Structure formats: C-alpha cells, structure tokens
C-alpha cells in the first residue's frame, strides 16, 4: 500500500543534494547542538527515512496535543503515538523559533538539522493518563517522568544521515530498501509480524497461519531498537530470529529489522505499528494476543485487555490502509501434538498446554528443561547462552555494615571458601571505597559471571549507579537476603550461612 | 623414621602453655612487627609444626652461609636450602639483636614472636650460584632479587598459632597429625609422592609401583603453598587430587596437603623434600624425572639434569634416613597399552607415546581432546574447568596511541560487532584514565572471561600494574599485536582486521 | 546345521575325511581354507602342519573323493580397501594388510579391550565377551601355601574384608577343601562363575589332578609362587597388598 499520508518521507532521499551543506553547518562553531538520547536515535531514524510517514521532523505543541487527545495529527491524519523531541530547561533555555539545532549522536556523528518551530512544556500526568492508560508502573509512564525532558521542542528535519550501526549492518533495510527488496522478488503480498522477544514454535506457526490465510510472504520484522526493560538483548534475539527463519520453507519469509523505540502502549501502539508497517511497503499485519503490552503490573491486573488491540486495530480499519490478520491465543496441543488458535479448539473436549514467558525465564534459570515441543532446541541453546542458569550466573555478597566480625578475615574466608567448589567461576573481594567509577563495574562482573565478595556496603547516595541484581546483603539487619544471627557471629558460622544460601539459590551445585 | 635432628619441632606444641602471653606480647604497642609475606608464612608454618625439623626460627648467617656452601647446617645437619626472614634495610635498621619481633599475617594475625640472633645483608648472587646454579631465569633466582628483601634476620621462634587457612580445613595434616593418622591404621611404611601439577595415568601407575615396591602404604602429600609461576592453582590441583585417590584401591592411599613453598631448586630441592617428608612420617619418599626442576630457560637448556635430582638424593643416601624410590621417565606404550619406566623397555622394539605438558597446556587451551589413556576424564574435565579454551577465554583489545581515528567511534563499532556474535562472553569498553585501581581490574575481567575494548593506552610507568595475558594491542607500530596499515585507517577495515585476529586466535568460533 | 562330530585335529588327514563326512551329509562342495583342522604351533613354535597341507592332500585326492573342493588362501584385510580378500590375489607389497589372530581375539576378551568393527560382526562379540568375559569379571583363587606361618584364619579373612570394600559384584568365599576331592572338584565351578575364593591352605599332590589349574594363585614363599612372599612370618597387612596388587595388575580388580 502507498506510505501514510501518501508519501514516503525518506529524507535522506529528499536530503541528498544537501549533505555537504548541512554537514559543514552542524558543524560550525555556532550553531546549537544536541546529542540525541537512546530512544531519539530511534524516533530520528524512522523519521528521516518514512517509516513515520508522514512526520518529517518531531511534533509541535499542535501535532502532539492533537496525538494525545485525538489519536490523529492535527490534520487528522491517524497517528496514535507522540514522537517528541525532549530536551531539559537548560538546553529549551537557548531555543528560540527559526532556530536551527545540529542533532548529534554520541556528541560525534552529525544527524541533522532540526529547525525549531515551537519549544513547549508538556503536561506529563495528561499524557501518560491519554496516551499510556495513567498506570505508573507501565513502561512508557515511567521512562516519561523518569527519563524523558521536560521540555519539547517540535520542528522540521532535515537529513544528514541516519544513525550509525555496526552490528547486523545489512539487515537493518529502511522502507525504500525493503520495497525494493520485495519487488525484485515480485512480491506483491507480504504479511509483517511485529515481535520483541524470541520466536518459539507458536510463533513459527501462526506467522505461517498467516502468510497461509493472507496468501501473502513473511517478512519477521523484529524490534531492535528499544523494548521493554528486561527483556531479551536484541544481539540474542536476532541470533534467535536468523535460526528460527530456517524453519521456513525455502523462498518463503524475509528478515529485516526494525530500529523503533517500542512504548508498549498496546493497542495505541498497535495501530501506530500497522502505520508503520505500510510505510515499510507490507499489504498485512499480524496482530496477536496482547500486541504490544506489558503484562500486568505488580498487583497483578491487566494494563491492557487481552485484545485490545485488536479492537482499536478494527475500528480504524478503513483509515489504516493494511490488511489487519488478528489471531486469538496460539496454543499448544499436546494429544494432536500440533498448535492452534484457542478460538478454533473445545477448550472443553480438548487439552491444551502452555509455558509462560515467566515460566519460560525460571527454567532458563533453573537449567530446566524446554520442551522440544515448545521451541526449536537451537532456539533455547542460543537463549541459554545469553541467559545462563544459576550455576554459571555471577554474584555479589556484600558484608553489611552491622557485621562486627573482621571484614578482611571474613572476606578471605568467603574468597577461600568459594574457591575449593571450583567449577569455573572467577571470584574477587572488591572494594569500591564509594567510589562510583568502581561501584558501576559491580554489575559488569556479575554479568561476567563472576562471584564478588564487598568488604562492605557504599554510601546511599551511590546506591542507584549499583546494578542490584544478584547483589545479596549479609546483614543482621531483617531486610538482609542473608540474615545473621549477630553482628559478632563466628566467620565459620558465617561463611557456612552464606555457602549454602547461594547454594540454594542455584549458585553453587554440588 | 625420626625427625630430621631426632627431635619433632612442633613448637606450637612447645609453646602450648605460653600462647596467651605470646600473643598479649605480640600485641602490645611497643613491639616491633613485621607482616610476613606469602613466601614468609608458608616457611614460618613449616618451622613452627616440625616439618623443618630440626630448625626452630629463620637462619642467621652462621647457619646461613653452611646451607649456600656446605649444604649443611652450621652443625652439619643435613640441610640444602636455605630458610630466611628477609626484611628491606628500612626495617632492618630499627632491628638489634636481643630485639623481639611480633611477627603477622595479613597484619591481622599474631603468628610468633622472633627473638633475633642477627641482621645481615646476604650476597644475593653467591646464593643464586650455589644453591640455585645461576641462572637468572631461575624461579629461585629471579625470587631472590626481585621479591627477597636485601635484609636477613636470623632468629629462634616462639609459637602463637599456624598461619591461618580457610580451604581444605582438616587436609593441611601437620607432622604430628599426620604421624597419628599413619599410626591409628597400623601404616608402619609410608611411601611419599610430591607433586605440584595435577596427576595423570602415569603419575597413579608411577605411585602404585613405589608402593608395591616400596611394599608401603601411598601418602599423595601435594604442595598448596607456592610452586612455580604459572603452575595450576592449588585449587583446581586439590580437586584433581581428589579425583584421582578413588582411583587407588580402597585403603591404600592418604591425601595431605604439604603448605610449603618450592623453591623449584632440582636437585638440591629433592634432598629437602626428603627430609621434610621424613619429618612427616614417610619411610619412603619418590624422587621421579627432573625432580623440583623447573624445565629448560628461553634458550632450551636445561635447569638441572633429568636425573641430577636423584644422584643428590642417592649421595646422602645413608644420612637422609629415609629410603628412596627413583623412577626412570615413565611413559606410555600403545600397544600394550601401559605405563612403565623407560628403563624398563627397549625403545628400539617398543614404541612409546607421550603427551608433555607444554602440549597439554595447548590442547586445553585449543579445546583439544586430551587422549582416553593420557588421564582420566574427571581430571580433564576439572582442569578444562579452570584453564578453558580460547573460545572461552577473555581478552583486552587496546586502541594503540598511533591510532588517528575516533577512540569512541572504533570503540563501540568494536563492541557492537562482537556484540552480534554472541556465544556468551561479556563485553565492555574499559576506560582506565591511568588509574591503577582501574589498571589492576583489566586481568580480573579476563579471568573471568570477558572482552575489553580499551579506548588508550596507560603511562609506561603503570604497565607493571596490568597483567599481559590476552592483551592484544592495535597500532600502526612494529610491535602492536594487531598492526594497523596506517593510524587513518577506516573503521570497518579495522573491525575486520580485529575480528579475524581473535577468530585466529579461537576467541571467536563459527 | 550342527555336525556332532568330534573332531581330532588331524590338519590333512582330516580334512580329506571331513570331505568325504560332508559329502555323506549330501554337499557338492567343500570349503578348505588355511590350516584346516590344524591344531597350531606346538609349545616350541613349530607347526603341526603346513598351512596348506591338507589343501594339498586334498588335492592329491581329488578324483577319489567325488566331492569338489573350494580352497582357500590366507582370507585377510585391506585397511584402505576397507575389505577381505584371499591373500594370493593382492600384492603383499603395494597393499597393507590386517590381521588380529585367535590369540589376540582370545587376549582382547581378556582384557575387555575394544575389537575393531572390522574384525566381526558386533552381536558376535558380545555374545563371546559375555562367556569370555574380561578379567574384570573373571573369578580367582588365592592359596595360602603352606610355607606360610603367619595365622591361616586371619590372613584369609583379612582377604576377605578386604576384597568386600572393593565391590562391584563379585562373591567371595573362604572355602576349606580338607582335601576332600568332593570339594576340590568344586573350586573350579566358583571360579567359572565369577568368584573369588579364599584357600586357608593346599591340597594334597596326590589329589592336584582334581583341581582346574586355571586361574588358581599360590602365595607362598617359595620360588615358584604366583605371589611370592618375602618370608613366611610376613605381616599380614604386607601380604594383603601383595595379594591386593597382584590381582589388581592382573585385571581381577580396577578402581
Ligand atoms: N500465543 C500467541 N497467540 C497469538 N499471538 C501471539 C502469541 N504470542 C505472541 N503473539 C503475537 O506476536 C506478536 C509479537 O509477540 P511479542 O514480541 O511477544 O509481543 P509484542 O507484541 O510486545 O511485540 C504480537 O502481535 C503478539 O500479540
Ligand atoms: N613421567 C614421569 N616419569 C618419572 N617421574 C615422573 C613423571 N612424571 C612426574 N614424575 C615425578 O613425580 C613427582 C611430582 O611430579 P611434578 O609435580 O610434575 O613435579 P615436581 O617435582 O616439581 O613436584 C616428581 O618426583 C617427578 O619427577
Ligand atoms: N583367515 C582365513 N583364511 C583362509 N581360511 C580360513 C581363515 N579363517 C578360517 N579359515 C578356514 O575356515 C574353516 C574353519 O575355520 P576354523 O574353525 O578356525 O578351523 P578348523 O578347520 O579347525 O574348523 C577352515 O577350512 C579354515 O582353514
Ligand atoms: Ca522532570
Ligand atoms: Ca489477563
Ligand atoms: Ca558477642
Ligand atoms: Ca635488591
Ligand atoms: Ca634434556
Ligand atoms: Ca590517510
Ligand atoms: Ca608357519
Ligand atoms: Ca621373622
Ligand atoms: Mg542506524
Ligand atoms: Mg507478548
Ligand atoms: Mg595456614
Ligand atoms: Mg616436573
Ligand atoms: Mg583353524
Ligand atoms: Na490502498
Ligand atoms: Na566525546
Ligand atoms: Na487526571
Ligand atoms: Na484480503
Ligand atoms: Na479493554
Ligand atoms: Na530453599
Ligand atoms: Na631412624
Ligand atoms: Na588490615
Ligand atoms: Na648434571
Ligand atoms: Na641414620
Ligand atoms: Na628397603
Ligand atoms: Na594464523
Ligand atoms: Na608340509
Ligand atoms: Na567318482
Ligand atoms: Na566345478
Ligand atoms: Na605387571
């Protein structure tokens, strides 16, 4: 289908004739400058290259207002997510309008130039009460009044290049390539399926399910961009997602990712995907269970409906200008050994079965078993990989600052002890002495695996740049992970306390 | 037998009814103290049960300068290396015999008290000549003048405690413990086996043949004090030891470990481990191929004799009272598919297989197979456990200063490229700003496996500071690990030249 | 189908007569390959036949015998070739040959050692190791020679305790013979089912005849002991590791 709004607005394209000039002007030494965040990497690049079609630059007052409280630009145009440029009152401070800002990335790489059309300060309860549903556990609550600027400033762009990427060069197709790409295989027909975590044999089926039912070709068009904190690295899923493909039938699906900052605003974002989507050149978009969401937040309710989504997708249907294959839960069937969609099966004359992403994560965790029903096993090795079970996972033990007993001896202690288990992992006392440049390799080494021993605790003023997973506090204190008895309790006593609270935890396995 | 001198030093012992006012004395503010250096407590430990019998504290010169020309003791004990408190001049100045010195461990722990005899300033190269044969790559030598203090203080001991350890609690049998383990299973004829790298088929069919010989109960009695640079730690070696005793038959072997530190001094070492293990309790004591050497220098020649060791040990035959059990070099024979000593088979009508260190040490580092016949699985396993293969390993990547492209840039290219390989390494880029606290982590995050991508070099000055395993460096230089054809060189091209350079070197395997 | 013949390893001469049985049976050809029914080398090396004698006789008698005769060269291996072949239509010389013999079969069985699939068939095997199996497996006897002074009864139960640590499925017994031929005859029945029995003492010369030598041990101080003792007064617990030894390099125990 045409690009929303009708035309594509590859401004690289439009831009090229430009670059040299632009260049030279993002970097004199007078002009403004800003080094875009992580998730304005994202928006820019499918800015300036039509994937937000018809956006060509980031919203005004007028346009965001309008997204917010109308799911549509101010022209009317179907839009349901606001892309803006948020920045702090410092910066919004120099702004003025006519102004032009050299958007950097990494204060290095010049993107391009965005001439400044309005500096506004939005009201971020409203937003997050219109456009995320109000819930302040939900992601894009949260990354609003934690995350982003104050201060927004709305303007037209104008294409330096995209952003640089060194990793999956080649895949990363922007729409004009993946059009490309189509036609010269005369693909007419193409179903995309939008997807943050790693594909599993439900996945393989309902996306075949639905290139079936469309008559259409597959194109995987996972996010790379940014998700949902903790979810999957998007290195593993994308190792995930080039395995799985060869599950395919030869000639049948294509893989291209997709730079976009996820918002998981369900069903808005679901609408604002199939947008998306059309530009990339795709005829169909598959639209699941609970696309886009969050799950529930810790008191257990839905931030979304189940199918939600699909609803909203519905009733925009003749604006979105793309073909809408909704699917209810895919389930698995253990008696048929086959899956399929829970509105096609007797829930009641028939067995289903299913694991949970939760539960998917604990056996990851645990080194449990996958069922080979469930997902390819090349699929969960690479998961296993970069999700290790316990036993090869790192730690952290850190002597609260209760304990009484001699931290150097007790250190050495714990450091000796953990070293007779053997078994691989490498174990250091670290002392970070508050100062941060120290406390925020914590995490690192955790990550690698290691197994940490802290001579005791940092500042509270330090504590947020220290990573605290797998981070354990031993402490008389009630809130300690490891309680002690008392802060003058036996090193022996001590040290056999926490061997066997990490060996119940998984750690240590004998 | 007897004790070395005929009489068991165990001042702990001793000293039993004098250790609360020891130690009152060893902390009180007007004593002088020393903290004992590693080398220092694994001698002290050794003088202070009676396995350094008949030594009671640390050589003055008297006693000294007899061990480094006679090989005796002042007295004429039988007595080859030499067993010194050395101190640097600063200390030294403050000591005056009659002087009493607290001495401690990990300035935390009273050990004992030292009444010194004298201070004297050793000729560091007469006792490198004489008793280590001069080479300046000798363990013993490059020891002695770049870790040694330049100060001895000669002294007699009095007990406080045992150096403190926290691993292998009850497998560090002191002379009198084990005596009295011998002695409650009726073992009336012990044959010792010192070691100080894991043991393999060889090693287990070497030690039966002693005992079967020897007609004599097996004590695997391992060194966990120091050894030789580069050894395998203690830890690793201790597992394999444990591995490899249910190996034996039930009830003909005991594992102790022996805390003391080498000296790597061939020959002479062996005439001392003799005594030492006499001390112990063996009746027997196995002196195999090069015995305590330490291999050949850079230029290939060789530290000691194959057998210099055991011609030593044979001249004091009627002095060391204790028997030895030589052993030619035991190899393997495929076809028979045995082990047995070289001198017990015509290499002209047998063929014979051997796997050398230095070709282990490969495999495991290649991930190479290690032969069904060359050790036994567990062992292997345990030790690919703590010396894994390169696609394993960690390494540091150092953008060389000739480099003329941007650190930054190269630096996340770098980490994103090998991001996308996965296979669970951890990456980091690693700016040390010439901070040793930093400096010194390098070799803690490629121990624990990870990959560093460091965007500078550090002053020639902080280079001691920084372990040089796996540390490749990228420059236009002569001498960079990875040379750059010209410091311009466009990013992609150096993201190649890296990657493949560690894909060579197995780092990374597809 | 299986001939009750018995057989009397007469090489030639026999062959020529198991022509002519075969023929009797209703064949109209007979196979006769490398050393037929040759009985091998004698203790000193030399062979009873030629390895074509009997081809050769049979040959002789040809016209006579009314039966066709099939022979056979040496049928080898070819590593390279991965095959078997007679060995008179290959060149010894540009081509390499394999051959594990029966005595190298019969040693393999012994030790629990690996036969090349090459060699046979794999159910062949097993059903060989299973009633030859490795020593491993086997069963033994240990005999406490009468030059022994040290006390018989602890001695054989020191044995006892001991080789009941080890495990792994073997039945051990102290069994008294007191020259009762009745029982002597039965030392061989546990030892071929896998037992390790414990002699407290020999057995009359005159009644040797009724035991099976066949792994039978003597532990005596004597010259000729399978287990040598260094002098009869031995400490017990030093003649429990000789014996523990011995039987461990002879593949009754591994640990
Ligand atoms: N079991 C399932 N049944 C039907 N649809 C599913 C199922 N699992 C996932 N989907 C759909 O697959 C797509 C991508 O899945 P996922 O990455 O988990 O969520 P997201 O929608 O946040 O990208 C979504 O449209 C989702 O609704
Ligand atoms: N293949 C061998 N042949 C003969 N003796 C050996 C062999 N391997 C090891 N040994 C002997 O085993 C003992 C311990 O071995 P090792 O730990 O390698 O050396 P070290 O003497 O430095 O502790 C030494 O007496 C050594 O000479
Ligand atoms: N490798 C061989 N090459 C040629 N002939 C063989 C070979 N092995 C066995 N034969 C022949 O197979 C027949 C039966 O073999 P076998 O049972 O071992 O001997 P026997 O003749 O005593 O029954 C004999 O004719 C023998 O010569
Ligand atoms: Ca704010
Ligand atoms: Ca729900
Ligand atoms: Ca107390
Ligand atoms: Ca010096
Ligand atoms: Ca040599
Ligand atoms: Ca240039
Ligand atoms: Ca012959
Ligand atoms: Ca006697
Ligand atoms: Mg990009
Ligand atoms: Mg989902
Ligand atoms: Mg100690
Ligand atoms: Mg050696
Ligand atoms: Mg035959
Ligand atoms: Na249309
Ligand atoms: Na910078
Ligand atoms: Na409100
Ligand atoms: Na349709
Ligand atoms: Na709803
Ligand atoms: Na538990
Ligand atoms: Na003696
Ligand atoms: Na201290
Ligand atoms: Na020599
Ligand atoms: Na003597
Ligand atoms: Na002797
Ligand atoms: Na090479
Ligand atoms: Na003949
Ligand atoms: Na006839
Ligand atoms: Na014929
Ligand atoms: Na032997």
Redesign the interface.
């Known amino acids: 289908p045409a690009p929303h709004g009708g035309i594509l607005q590859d401004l690289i394209a439009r831009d090229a004739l430009k670059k040299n000039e632009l260049l030279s002007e993002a970097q004199s030494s007078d002009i403004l400058v800003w080094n875009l965040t992580p998730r304005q990497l994202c928006d820019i690049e499918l800015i300036l290259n039509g994937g937000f079609s018809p956006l060509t630059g980031f919203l005004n007052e007028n346009d965001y207002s309008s997204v917010v409280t109308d799911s549509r630009l101010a022209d009317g145009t179907l839009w349901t997510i606001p892309i803006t440029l948020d920045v702090d009152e410092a910066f919004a401070n120099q702004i003025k309008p006519d102004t032009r800002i050299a958007l950097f990335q ?1 204060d ?2 010049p993107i391009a130039i965005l001439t400044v059309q309005d500096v506004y300060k939005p009201n971020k309860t409203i937003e997050a009460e219109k456009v995320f549903r109000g819930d302040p556990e939900h992601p894009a609550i949260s990354y609003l009044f934690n995350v982003a600027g104050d201060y927004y400033v709305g303007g037209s762009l104008e294409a330096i290049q995209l952003p ?5 060069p080649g895949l990363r197709k922007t729409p004009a390539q993946l059009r490309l790409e189509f036609q010269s295989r005369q693909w007419d027909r193409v179903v995309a399926f939008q997807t943050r975590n790693p594909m599993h044999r439900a996945h393989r089926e309902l996306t075949v399910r639905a290139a079936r039912e469309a008559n259409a070709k597959v194109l995987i068009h996972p996010v790379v961009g940014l998700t949902k904190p903790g979810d999957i ?1 998007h ?2 899923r ?2 995930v997602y080039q395995e799985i493909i060869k599950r395919y039938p030869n000639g049948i699906a294509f893989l291209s990712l997709l730079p976009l900052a996820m918002r998981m605003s369900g069903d808005r974002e679901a609408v604002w995907h199939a947008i998306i989507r059309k530009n990339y050149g795709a005829s169909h978009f598959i639209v699941g269970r609970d696309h886009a969401g969050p799950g529930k937040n810790s008191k257990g309710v839905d931030f979304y409906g189940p199918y939600d989504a699909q609803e909203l997708v519905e009733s925009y249907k003749h604006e979105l200008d793309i073909e809408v294959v909704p699917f209810r839960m895919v389930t698995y069937l253990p008696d048929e050994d086959r899956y399929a969609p829970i509105d096609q099966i007797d829930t009641t004359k028939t067995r289903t079965l299913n694991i949970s992403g939760t539960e998917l994560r604990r056996r990851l965790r645990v080194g449990g078993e996958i069922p080979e029903w469930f997902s390819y096993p090349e699929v969960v090795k ?1 998961l296993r ?2 999700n ?1 079970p316990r036993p090869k996972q ?1 730690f952290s033990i850190v002597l609260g600052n209760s304990l009484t007993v ?1 931290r ?2 007790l250190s ?2 714990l ?3 953990f ?2 288990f ?3 992992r ?1 174990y ?1 006392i670290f002392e970070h002495n508050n ?1 941060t ?2 406390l925020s ?1 914590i995490q ?2 955790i ?4 197994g940490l021993i802290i001579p005791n605790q940092w500042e509270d003023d330090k504590d947020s740049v220290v990573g605290k997973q797998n981070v354990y506090l031993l402490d008389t204190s009630s809130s300690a992970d490891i309680q002690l008895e008392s802060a003058d309790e036996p ?2 006593h001590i ?1 056999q306390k926490v061997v066997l609270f990490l060996e119940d935890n998984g750690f240590f396995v004998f």
Chains 1, 2 share one sequence.
């Open positions: 990494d290095e790489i640089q990427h060194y990793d999956y690295d290195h593993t994308v190792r690479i990989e970069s290790p790192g001699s150097e001896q050495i202690a450091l000796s002890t070293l007779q053997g078994g691989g490498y250091k100062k440049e120290l390799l690192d080494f990550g690698s695996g290691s090193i022996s040290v």
